Design a protein around this ligand. Structure first.
Ligand SMILES: Nc1ncnc2c1ncn2[C@@H]1O[C@H](COP(=O)(O)OP(=O)(O)OP(=O)(O)O)[C@@H](O)[C@H]1O
Ligand SMILES: Nc1ncnc2c1ncn2[C@@H]1O[C@H](COP(=O)(O)OP(=O)(O)O)[C@@H](O)[C@H]1O
Lengths: 647, 438
């Protein structure tokens, strides 16, 4: 069958989008000239301290100026004799001594020698040649030592009038003009769920899931490392798997039905997403193979003839003994049989019959006549055998001109018998690599007591030609071909195998990873083994079991369900809000006005919310000046309704 | 859609003024009998009837029971119609004047409207409130919903083995509960548990639908006499304790009339009087035409359409009187007798065409004349039973429509009663080894 890959279209392939550099060095000094023109109290520099992308700018604009990773790298060249240290996006990911300011897997800054240089790059590329207020983001329920060290770097290293910490998801809430809802924000490091009641975060009961976009990238890297099992010739970076996740993953609506019928052959060509990576001499070789083949055939023919001659000589010897036994006394017959190492006259007849059957199946002029007569007998035997086979074939054809059913039942029974023989042999073969098997125990007991495929193909060919109910699928060859196994469809796809070409081995196919990797947000304990709860189950635990049991609020289902919106960067998947809406619809009572939506600029509204917040009266009543840092200490918290709890 | 002997009967085929029209709704001809049966149908619908008898004369081969199925499809599914033959009145457990009243009480219909409020869904909790009332949260795929239970429906839930997360099906009104299975979210709790894992229903939790549904008064009689079905567990022995039909006394029926009239006066139920079609009434003997002459005089009795094909015959059970139709003249004066005349030769061809286009068997006009020839010269039931075998002799021989040759073969493969009687008498002459045994 050539059908499943004959009319199959040529593939549409996508290259690798690795997070490289970009050719820009702007020393932007046009922001300070506009910042010094505004009246005082309404100028502040806002820095979103994101784990994937630190953003920074001035509050009176809409887009942030700098958007860099926390990557830095320092060098010393002995061939040049100079110390290098550049940071940010200026690192190319040719040299890499990369260490990040954030700890891998958690949005808590603990690599302060990197964070100092990152802030240094920020204040250089904004333009600082000399004292503005700083609005800066942090993680939910941040550790006190990290806030102390960050405040120490802000005051002591650089010198600032005031800074104030806030939660970036709550800033994106305040920019999205919400009042009371349930902010679910899936960030790069962790996925937070925060209930907000009348512009105030209820941080005593917010729950963070320990999964994020970095975990997406690392788990995608692990599954592409274990899918392509025998060794993939290619550098499997984490960032290129992240860019695979960004544009080739979507949360499926109904997961257990979509998953089980996903790797079927019918339609795998549209589910699969594929990723590249960067006559005379043939006649002489054919003649040499023909000549070596001819010599082997000649040697084989000689050995065959020699064996036939030996069998003829042996047959003549036993026939001579049979003739000498005709008319001799019982004592002389026993002597002749003992000389021929035979037990009885019946054993002699069996040997003669076996030799005759075998031969039938298979001075100088005297020698030539003997060889010629032997060949004529062998030819006569072969001709007789061929005549017998031809007669059997004719009779079989004549019988076929008659009954076919009884003939088909016999052929089916013969097929089953031969299959059983093949299975018995496979069993014996598997047992031969084993011991407990009773097969070695029976052998040891015996030692201790002493101390087909061609035939199947022939039958299948006959059934294919004459039997309409027998299809190619029922053949042994069909039960043994790539189109049958799922592992070829899982690694490679419905197209045939890789012939080890240039642009064929360097390919990664994605089938299940599209819907398995973004599914860990909902079933964490089974897919990736993180022993926590799903997003739906956390949202239901907060909406149905904690908020009705909290005194001081009026309506637990009638208020928090008015606006549940989705903030973070790990949210822009196709069909993500609908899955959460169906889960909450399954959990909540009937009739709740559930309306799940998302923010407008999901990766950039966390900056714009603190941009709009930066120069108001509540922010002016929540700053920490320099003398307050000198007097109150380091871990001093102006209790704002967006920041964490005071201590 | 399978063909019966009365598939092509759809209705009486009348005008608006109650006049039958020829070749209408499946019938061919037979004008006055269809007009009289139309008057009978209007009498049944008029609800001014407490026992009327209608007899249908005419020999075999004419359309007596076709008129009855025309009436049964003219009334519709609403008004009950009970067809019984005469021979069903004999039993070995009850007297034969009690099975007649059982058929009369199967004839009358009692229509009740209900608004069933069904509850599909997964049990969320089983919380006994008072110390009594037990709340149940029924989680669907659209939302859960609290539900307060009576302390008697909970003892029907508890007899069923419903524990934590079994999906259930509570009737709110009738209080009927079924455990459908265990929900598939709790499927792989253990690994070889033995339940029926079904998914959570992806609909409402509170489906409100209304059902119109009928009850015959005989079912009221049986359900008030003996306990039936639900809690009758000693009936699994079988010998003496089975639900044997028992002699329902007149006092029980006289009280069930009081209770049903009470529930009609509240406007709950509606009453519809039915039709009892007793076919081949000669098998009714004189110990039942005595009892019909009383039982039709009740003010509750339904209309009785009797059918009888015999001439002046002997009334069964009393061998010393002959009467017309096998009906005693003590009873025959009650009946409205409708004649049923035979068929002309130009009214058999249309029956052949209608019966042919009912079975889908298409055939030429040279064969319709031959089937009509066998219809005139032999019988009507026999000529209509050659349209189906000849089509089998048509599609086998590489044809689609039936010609004269297939029917000329089927008349030899399938002999009627008359030519078989001629072979039985004349050809089977001597009674010996290879003869018939009279
Ligand atoms: N178009 C897109 N589709 C899907 N995912 C995207 C898209 N664009 C960005 N992302 C994801 O968003 C993530 C970046 O999120 P973001 O930088 O806003 O988090 P963050 O605010 O730094 O987190 P934290 O507040 O913990 O520091 C990346 O992991 C990336 O996979
Ligand atoms: N007017 C009619 N139109 C069509 N078919 C009829 C008509 N009258 C009788 N028949 C046929 O007569 C047959 C029924 O005969 P039936 O009434 O049962 O005789 P009886 O009542 O004596 O047993 C049915 O096959 C039906 O096709």
């Amino acid at each position: 069958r050539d059908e499943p890959w004959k009319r199959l279209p040529p593939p549409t392939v996508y290259p690798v989008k690795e997070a490289r550099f970009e050719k820009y060095i702007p020393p932007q000094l046009d922001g300070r000239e506009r910042a010094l023109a505004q009246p005082p109290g309404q100028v502040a520099i806002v820095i979103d301290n994101g784990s994937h992308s630190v953003r920074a700018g001035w509050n009176f604009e809409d887009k942030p100026r700098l958007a860099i990773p926390p990557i830095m790298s320092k060098y010393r060249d002995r061939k040049m004799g100079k110390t290098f240290s550049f940071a940010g996006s200026d690192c190319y990911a040719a040299r890499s001594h990369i260490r990040n300011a954030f700890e891998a897997g958690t949005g808590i800054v603990s690599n302060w020698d990197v964070m100092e240089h990152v802030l240094d790059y920020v204040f250089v590329k904004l333009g600082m040649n000399e004292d503005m207020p700083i609005v800066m983001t942090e993680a939910v329920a941040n550790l006190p030592y990290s806030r102390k060290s960050m405040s120490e770097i802000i005051f002591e290293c650089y010198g600032a009038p005031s800074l104030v910490y806030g939660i970036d998801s709550l800033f994106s809430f305040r920019h999205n003009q919400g009042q009371t809802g349930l902010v679910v924000s899936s960030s790069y490091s962790a996925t937070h769920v925060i209930p907000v009641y009348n512009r105030k975060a209820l941080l005593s009961q917010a729950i963070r899931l320990n999964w994020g976009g970095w975990h997406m990238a690392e788990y995608m890297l692990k599954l592409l490392k274990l899918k392509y099992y025998t060794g993939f010739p290619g550098k499997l970076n984490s960032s290129q798997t992240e860019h695979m996740v960004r544009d080739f993953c979507y949360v499926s609506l109904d997961y257990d039905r979509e998953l089980a019928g996903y790797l079927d052959w019918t339609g795998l060509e549209d589910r699969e997403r594929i990723v590249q990576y960067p006559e005379e001499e043939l006649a002489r070789i054919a003649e040499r193979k023909k000549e070596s083949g001819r010599r082997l055939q000649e040697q084989a023919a000689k050995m065959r003839l020699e064996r036939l001659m030996k069998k003829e000589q042996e047959l003549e010897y036993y026939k001579d003994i049979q003739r000498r036994m005709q008319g001799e006394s019982k004592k002389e017959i026993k002597r002749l049989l003992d000389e021929a190492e035979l037990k009885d006259e019946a054993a002699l007849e069996r040997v003669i019959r076996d030799l005759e059957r075998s031969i039938k199946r298979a001075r100088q002029q005297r020698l030539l006549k003997s060889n010629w007569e032997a060949r004529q007998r062998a030819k006569a035997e072969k001709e007789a055998e061929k005549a017998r086979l031809a007669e059997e074939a004719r009779l079989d054809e004549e019988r076929r001109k008659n009954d076919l059913e009884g003939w088909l039942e016999e052929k089916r029974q013969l097929r089953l018998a031969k299959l059983n023989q093949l299975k018995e042999r496979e069993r014996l073969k598997a047992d031969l690599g084993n011991r407990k098997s009773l097969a070695s125990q029976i052998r040891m007991k015996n030692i201790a007591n002493l101390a087909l495929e061609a035939a199947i193909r022939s039958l299948e060919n006959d059934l294919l030609r004459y039997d309409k109910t027998f299809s190619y699928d029922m053949t042994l060859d069909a039960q043994r071909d790539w189109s049958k196994s799922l592992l070829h469809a899982f690694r490679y796809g419905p197209r045939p195998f890789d012939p080890s070409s240039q642009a064929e081995t360097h390919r990664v196919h994605l089938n299940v990873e599209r819907i398995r990797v973004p599914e860990v947000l909902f079933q964490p304990a089974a897919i990736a083994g993180v022993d926590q709860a799903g997003l739906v189950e956390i949202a239901g635990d907060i909406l149905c079991q904690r908020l009705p049991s909290l005194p001081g609020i009026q309506d637990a289902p009638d208020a928090f369900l008015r606006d549940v919106f989705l903030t973070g960067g790990n949210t822009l998947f196709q069909n993500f809000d609908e899955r959460l809406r169906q889960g909450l619809m399954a959990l909540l009572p009937v009739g709740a006005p559930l309306r799940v939506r998302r923010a407008q600029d999901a990766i950039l509204d966390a900056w714009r919310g603190a941009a709009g917040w930066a120069c108001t009266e509540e922010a002016k009543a929540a700053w920490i000046t320099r003398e307050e840092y000198l007097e109150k200490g380091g871990e001093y918290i102006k209790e704002h309704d967006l920041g964490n709890a005071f201590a | 859609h399978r063909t019966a002997a009365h598939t092509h009967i759809k209705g009486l085929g009348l005008n608006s003024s109650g006049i039958a029209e020829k070749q209408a709704a499946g019938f061919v001809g037979q004008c006055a009998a269809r007009e009289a049966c139309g008057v009978v149908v209007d009498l049944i619908k008029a609800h001014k009837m407490a026992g009327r008898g209608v007899l249908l004369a005419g020999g075999p081969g004419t359309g007596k029971t076709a008129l009855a199925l025309a009436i049964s499809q003219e009334l519709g599914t609403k008004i009950p119609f009970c067809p019984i033959t005469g021979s069903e009145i004999y039993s070995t457990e009850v007297k034969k004047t009690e099975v007649l009243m059982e058929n009369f009480r199967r004839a009358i219909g009692l229509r009740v409207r209900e608004t069933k409020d069904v509850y599909e869904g997964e049990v969320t909790e089983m919380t006994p409130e008072e110390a009594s009332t037990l709340l149940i949260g029924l989680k669907s795929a659209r939302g859960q919903k609290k539900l307060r239970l009576d302390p008697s429906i909970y003892e029907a839930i508890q007899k069923e083995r419903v524990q934590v997360g079994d999906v259930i099906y509570i009737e709110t009104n009738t209080g009927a509960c079924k455990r459908v299975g265990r929900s598939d979210a709790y499927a792989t709790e253990f690994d070889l548990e033995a339940e029926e894992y079904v998914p959570i229903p992806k609909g409402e939790v509170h489906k409100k639908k209304e059902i119109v549904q009928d009850v015959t008064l005989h079912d009221l009689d049986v359900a008030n006499a003996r306990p039936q079905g639900g809690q009758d567990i000693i009936s699994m022995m079988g010998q003496l304790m089975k639900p044997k039909m028992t002699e329902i006394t007149d006092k029980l029926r006289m009280e069930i009339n009081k209770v049903v009239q009470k529930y009609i006066n509240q406007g709950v139920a509606e009453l519809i009087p039915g039709v009892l079609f007793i076919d081949e009434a000669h098998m009714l003997d004189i110990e039942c035409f005595t009892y019909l002459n009383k039982a039709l005089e009740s003010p509750i009795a339904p209309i009785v359409v009797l059918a009888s094909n015999r001439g002046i015959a002997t009334i069964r059970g009393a061998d010393d009187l002959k009467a017309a139709h096998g009906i005693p003249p003590d009873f025959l004066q009650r009946l409205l007798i409708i004649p049923t005349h035979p068929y002309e030769p130009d009214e058999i061809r249309r029956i052949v065409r209608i019966r042919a286009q009912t079975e889908g068997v298409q055939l030429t006009d040279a064969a319709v004349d031959r089937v009509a020839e066998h219809g005139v010269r032999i019988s009507l039931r026999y000529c209509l039973q050659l349209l189906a075998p000849a089509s089998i002799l048509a599609r086998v021989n590489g044809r689609t429509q039936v010609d004269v040759q297939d029917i000329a073969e089927a008349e030899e493969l399938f002999l009627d009663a008359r030519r078989s009687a001629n072979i039985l008498t004349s050809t089977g002459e001597s009674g010996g080894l290879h003869g018939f045994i009279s």
